[PDB]
Design a protein around this ligand. Structure first.
Ligand SMILES: CCN(CC)S(=O)(=O)c1ccc(C)cc1
Ligand SMILES: CCN(CC)S(=O)(=O)c1ccc(C)cc1
Ligand code: NA
Ligand code: NA
Lengths: 330, 330
């Protein structure tokens, strides 16, 4: 029922967007079918955890505050696809960075990125045209999107000086995770579920923001370790954080407990594509027992999460049930 | 006074955006100064015709409907910078297409494009937080931005089949100009001036949209001819429409009046970087007396413009004065 309803609304949203182009933007069928394929390629095939989270928050709040149910659930599905389209937009933008007479494939990739973002506005302005929260929804959505772009800047420049391992600290690592990932992956689905359920001013936002940041941190630390030690055919991709000189949890944790000569060896081998230098970094990580510290770090974070949901439950019990399910996914 | 007030509000807007990053997004001074420089580089130095148009529409409506004057004029200046920032965003996106181990300059260019667009939302949500039109403003702004991205798609793919001179027609040329340029360069400043002046539902939008499309068409046809025949040091850039196989006014007009063998020669030489083939295309344009048809075409368009402003003047006299000044700039 959850996934089945999410996919039906996708068909409804897609048909509105494509018919709107046909009927109001003078688009020819060849381009409509081209955009239908591009939308399917970029928005479908993931796990939809951000979008389904909106629905779960919505159903948990109509059980503890007929016609309002069906409407709130449909609005939750449209909000779920807003985030999924936003995620598709970020992935297209991220491919343009590493993918490389006018090059029409790069022109169309840039265009795809612009269309996917604009589609989030177009579907909200249509399906929520008569909702009292449309203005608040757009503002909280645009602010989270801005937050993510700022987080991207923090991440991309963490090894230089914007016109260098000084910013390789744990507090800066958390700032990157917070802005680049946590706000739109964990906080935004929860907020949108509260908005369509009319129960936004009934929750402790501070505890909610604190939980979203902590859950993103838990997820990103595990992602950083898997990027380094999980082999490609099991991870799903080729891990590249060492070659890309990423400010990863492994890198900042190693620098805190390495000897002066190891730091020299780390700094000499980090951020290179050579197989031996990458392997030297993995050797340094192993010999520093980082995968031992990884277990303890996540355990402590999980304790802060498992104990922060209860504060939220004292005044928002239905909210905390969905936050627990979202945490269980992490 | 007009330009002097527009630049003061720029300083106010910039200081809010940068302080917001410092105070609410945890941004370090090195990055704040980096973004201040990027903002100055991308948003300043143009002619500001889109942004000043908002102010001119605003002042023409407070003269024919003290505290309301100063507020509406400040709101007009913020709306003017929204469009200017949006223009800066499109130019950054356009540079990524032709500008080309992670390449941090391309990463920062993509990031710049995202920040410039998000800044349009952030400045509107702040300076219009207590305005009744904030929601309508955001929706009309997002729809025009969407319109421009659709126009980009029409332009970039006018020579292929989205997975070829069939789309080299005058009606398709107008569709490209309408969506890619006219809506955000001519219609959007007028609309925003009406929104902040509270006089939006007091004008004939059909005549207004018709004028915006016609003015963009007039401007783009002149731009197409200058791109081909005005030498680079006088045009300000190297004209590249022939090499890029653009659907220009010259190309669609030539195909309507060329002989079968000339079309073969045109099709054989169009869309190539070779100096002789580009010169052959210029030779074909000259021998077809296109710069003679150019004068007549603009004259006829100017007549439709000079006569459409009067319809708008019968019910919106103050509006038509600013539209005349905007047309005079064209
Ligand atoms: C603004 C997003 N950024 C790219 C412009 S990003 O932070 O690198 C990013 C890339 C991909 C994903 C799924 C999320 C974020
Ligand atoms: C969405 C805009 N497009 C780029 C993504 S564009 O139509 O090519 C364009 C480029 C530059 C300018 C100033 C205007 C439009
Ligand atoms: Na998701
Ligand atoms: Na301008």
């Amino acid at each position: 029922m959850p996934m089945q309803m999410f996919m039906q609304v996708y068909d409804e949203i897609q048909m509105f967007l494509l018919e709107e182009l046909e009927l109001k933007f003078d688009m020819d069928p060849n381009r409509v079918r081209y955009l239908r394929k591009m939308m399917d390629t970029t928005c479908l095939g993931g796990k939809y955890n951000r979008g389904l989270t909106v629905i779960d928050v919505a159903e948990s709040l109509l059980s503890l505050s007929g016609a309002r149910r069906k409407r709130v659930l449909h609005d939750a599905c449209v909000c779920g696809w807003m985030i999924e389209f936003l995620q598709a937009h970020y992935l297209v933008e991220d491919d343009i960075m590493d993918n490389s007479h006018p090059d029409v494939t790069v022109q169309c990739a840039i265009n795809d990125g612009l269309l996917l973002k604009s589609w989030t506005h177009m579907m909200a302005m249509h399906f929520f045209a008569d909702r009292p929260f449309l203005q608040d929804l757009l503002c909280r959505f645009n602010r989270v999107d801005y937050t993510t772009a700022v987080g991207q800047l923090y991440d991309v420049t963490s090894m230089f000086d914007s016109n260098d391992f000084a910013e390789f600290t744990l507090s800066n690592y958390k700032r990157i995770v917070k802005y680049k990932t946590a706000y739109y992956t964990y906080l935004l689905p929860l907020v949108m579920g509260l908005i369509v359920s009319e129960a936004l001013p009934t929750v402790d936002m501070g505890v909610t923001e604190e939980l979203a940041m902590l859950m993103g941190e838990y997820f990103q630390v595990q992602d950083d370790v898997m990027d380094c030690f999980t082999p490609p055919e099991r991870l799903g991709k080729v891990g590249t954080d060492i070659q890309d000189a990423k400010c990863s949890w492994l890198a900042v944790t190693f620098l805190a407990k390495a000897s002066s000569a190891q730091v020299a060896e780390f700094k000499a081998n980090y951020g290179s594509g050579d197989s031996e230098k990458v392997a030297t970094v993995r050797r340094l990580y192993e010999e520093a027992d980082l995968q031992g510290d990884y277990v303890a770090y996540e355990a402590a974070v999980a304790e802060q999460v498992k104990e922060l949901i209860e504060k939220l439950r004292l005044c928002s019990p239905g909210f905390a049930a969905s936050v627990e399910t979202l945490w269980g996914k992490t």
